[model samples]
Target: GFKQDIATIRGDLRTYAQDIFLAFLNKYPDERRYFKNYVGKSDQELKSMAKFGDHTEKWFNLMMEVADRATDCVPLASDANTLVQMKQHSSLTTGNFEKLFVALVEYMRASGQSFDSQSWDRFGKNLVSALSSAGMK
Candidate 1:
């Protein structure tokens, strides 16, 4: 049920990616500074960039990978690229992932979609721990 919820909530990859990323950006404006490439770009400019889209797509991919692993923790959260991105961003904190969860779930609800918060909540905790262990502090 949880995995299916993820797939359904995440329908139409690119559109979903853009929606969630923008929802995140717009919801937590403070986190935008961590997106170094988006540093000087306006919202519209950021939205149009393939670079942003690619990052967003991989982001959703990580979630998909996490879901595919079922109830287990997402070890891939600590993969090399994630470490690289975390260090480069410089503030990929546990709270930031919580902010991301808030953005995703609330935005989904706004669009007439939603999920099992308990499951996603645990997933977020697992993700934060995994990333934290990888040095995302």
Candidate 2:
């Protein structure tokens, strides 16, 4: 994963979120209500509506660009004893989606920021709602 600071990551994440919302709206203009359910009527929403037709593909491509930059980092023991002990057993604590979300929350917590599980759930719901619509298309 890129070792950028939290501020940089926050900015990038916000921008990525905006880009993804825009792409979904453009590809399905009549489906703006789905975006409004999560994002509400804010600047991001207005900007997306205004830029709906023009450069739609460009905005959509940005979503793919951000997705390609996705990375994951997790804590794992490096000591020889720990490695050897695990040879007889195997387990998984996280799935792909859980890993990414948990890693993000952990990173924020490590940076002295408060993370609310409810808020994350809300955001995750919104993200899943929009992305699911696109997937169905």
Candidate 3:
């Protein structure tokens, strides 16, 4: 029970941090050193850092690193197209899955919910189930 509880808590914390980072980046326009402090920098500071163009690499890299660290975070941290596809695929099923399928549909219905509450859990479980179902393990 203790081990299981720890695992669940760790998973939730990881997802929460990921969501906050993503939300901040979403709100702040990408620019230089925007990630010097994870709290995010202002547009004025961004402009002071550069006359024109977005040098959001620092912020982007930090977010990518965070996603990469989480096992179920998917590899879309770099590719926007892949990110879209990943989001779409997460909600698709053969009309057989239960709670996760329903939850995802509800999540989609809820306009503009920043965090996918069960994203990490569903992702991890889907990966494992897929591999096992395909006779990988």
Candidate 4:
């Protein structure tokens, strides 16, 4: 079932979220300015920061919610809610969301997880569409 599939990789998803966050920082150094409070901290240090942990947990929870409602309207609602939350953050942009999606797909490949690609793709497209509908590019 969808819940089982999500539970199977739940831990991996958490780790992947952190890895994606780190990768985003590395790939887009200027974006680190978003974490101004963590200035001068190393990547590892930043990971341990409260703000980082909070963001990572929020993302994981959002993903879990989407998976839990894969067949319902909740996914769309969740995506729109997430987009609004991201928009509230001055440093978050649609490009950041795109990078996060790329990181998620790459993580699945690297971990050799046999996720349902079609479903995942659908979710990704739905998320992007929701973001666009919410006035994001």
Better candidate number, 1 or 2, judged by TM-score: 1
Model 3 C-alpha lDDT versus the unseen true structure: 0.38
How far off is residue 106 in model 1, in Å?
1.5
lDDT of 4 by residue, 1-137 (tens): 34565776576666766776676666556766666675577888977787786777677777777767666322566556665666445456567666666656655555566766545555666666676677665
Clashes of each: 0, 0, 0, 0
- With a 3 Å backbone cut-off (N, CA, C), the pairs that clash in candidate 4 are none
Colliding residue pairs in candidate 2: none
Q: Give per-residue lDDT, candidate 4, residue 25.
A: 67
Quick one: best lDDT, which candidate?
1
Report, for every candidate in turn, its global Cα lDDT versus the true structure.
0.70, 0.38, 0.38, 0.64
In terms of lDDT, the poorest run of 10 residues in model 4 is 70-79
Top model number, TM-score: 1
* lDDT string, candidate 3, 62-134, tens digits: 3334344444444332332332244333433332223333433343345363444456445434543553353
For candidate 1, the 10 contiguous residues with the lowest summed lDDT are 72-81
Q: Which portions of model 4 show Cα errors greater than 4 Å? A: 1-5, 11-14, 38-40, 72-74, 85-87, 90-92
lDDT of 2 by residue, 1-137 (tens): 22243234355554544544444444444444422243445545555565443443443343234333333221122221232234321231113224334444444444443444344443334333333333311
* Candidate 2 TM-score versus the reference: 0.26
Error of 3 at 47 (Å): 3.7
Give the per-residue lDDT digits (tens) of candidate 1, residues 78-107.
Answer: 452364364445655667877998787677
- Quote model 3's TM-score: 0.21
